[PDB]
Design a protein around this ligand. Structure first.
Ligand code: WGM
Length: 185
């Protein structure tokens, strides 16, 4: 792909984070803590899952960023509406305002309803995410495999400002402690 020139500098929004997440000083890395991180509750925090939003809001244009997923067993990545549900249980779907892919139990799937199997020969260590607001497109790229396409959501109905979306996943196994990292431009 040739989307690198739309690169944007994403930072994480501490106020949206699940209360167990630990965000680095530079707001570029996030990981699951082994306990509550001693923050107050607020209506923005994701309560049920280890999720956080980017601070940036997008309502036009073309945007590109990259995320490092090295040594993780489970994660979700993509974009979502600014007005997604924060509290309680929900599924990641375009109907609920999410355009995401994930790793879970050694398989990769796109967050359609129902979910779509992805075909990845080279497990990615870094994911590229491309958003074309006007076209209604969210695309995912395998940076480890020379930028090969993973998945394209087209005919997207964003219906609001978009935010970068992250889920570090649970660490029930002891094998999923590694962080998500926003990779330099
Ligand atoms: C008392 C809070 C800090 C948490 N809260 C809620 N948390 C989970 C489910 C439903 C809620 F209304 C409302 C308010 O923002």
């Amino acid at each position: 792909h040739h989307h690198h020139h739309h690169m944007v500098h994403i930072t994480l929004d501490r106020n949206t984070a699940n209360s167990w997440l630990i965000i680095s000083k530079d707001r570029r890395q996030v990981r699951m803590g082994d306990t509550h991180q001693n923050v107050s509750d607020n209506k923005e925090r994701f309560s049920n899952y280890p999720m956080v939003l980017g601070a940036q809001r997008f309502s036009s244009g073309k945007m590109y960023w990259e995320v490092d997923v090295t040594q993780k067993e489970a994660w979700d990545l993509g974009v979502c509406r600014d007005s997604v549900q924060r509290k309680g249980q929900f599924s990641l779907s375009p109907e609920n305002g999410f355009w995401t892919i994930w790793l879970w139990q050694d398989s990769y799937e796109a967050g359609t309803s129902p979910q779509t199997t992805l075909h990845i020969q080279v497990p990615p260590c870094q994911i590229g995410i491309f958003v074309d607001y006007e076209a209604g497109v969210v695309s995912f790229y395998n940076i480890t495999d020379h930028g090969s396409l993973i998945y394209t959501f087209s005919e997207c109905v964003f219906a609001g400002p978009l935010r970068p979306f992250f889920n570090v996943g649970f660490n029930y196994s002891g094998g999923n402690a590694a962080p998500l990292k926003l990779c330099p431009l």
